[PDB]
């Protein structure tokens, strides 16, 4: 190879346009049916340790 290099500085517009797909998407959260805490679905609740309606975990 022969060391490719940028030909022109990237403009503010083109830099920020490239970044138009970078925004985070918020985390998916459901209420825990036992303690009403907001938590990812399909995880053992980190606030009360219940899952599938029963205590799985000391928290």
């Amino acid at each position: 190879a022969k060391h490719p290099v940028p030909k022109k500085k990237t403009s503010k517009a083109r830099r920020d346009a490239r970044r138009s797909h970078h925004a985070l998407t918020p985390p998916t959260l459901v209420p825990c049916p036992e303690c009403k805490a907001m938590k990812p679905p399909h995880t053992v609740c980190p606030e009360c340790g219940y899952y599938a309606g029963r205590k799985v975990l000391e928290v």
């Binding site: 938590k39 995880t43 053992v44 980190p46 899952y51 799985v56």
Partner: protein, 118 residues
């Protein structure tokens, strides 16, 4: 292509991956429940379930087969005397994986519990 290929690789060569499964089995069979990454948890099910099933058969041959992976005679003895008889009527499904809510801080890894079923 990976078409219809079975079994994770876990970025380990042959002997390391086999030693990973053996070591996790000893740990799970010892404590009843462990925490790993979700991918490791899922692959550990089939490995342990097979050892538990051979324990249920109970013969000398089964014990010698199990010993190839577990090596600890006192632990195989625990597997045959205590662990296996509480699964006499259970046909498969001797382990369960439940995903944990919080990721590991240093690398974001999703975690899961693996345990023996009641």
């Amino acid at each position: 292509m990976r078409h219809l290929k079975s079994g994770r690789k876990l970025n380990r060569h042959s002997s390391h991956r086999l030693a990973l499964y053996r070591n996790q089995a000893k740990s799970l069979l010892t404590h009843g429940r462990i925490t790993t990454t979700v991918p490791k948890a899922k692959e550990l099910r089939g490995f342990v379930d097979h050892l538990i099933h051979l324990a249920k058969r109970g013969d000398l041959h089964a014990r010698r087969l199990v010993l190839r992976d577990l090596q600890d005679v006192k632990l195989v003895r625990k597997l045959f005397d205590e662990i296996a008889p509480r699964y006499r009527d259970r046909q498969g499904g001797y382990t369960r994986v439940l995903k944990l809510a919080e990721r590991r801080r240093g690398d974001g890894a999703p975690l899961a519990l693996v345990e023996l079923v009641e």
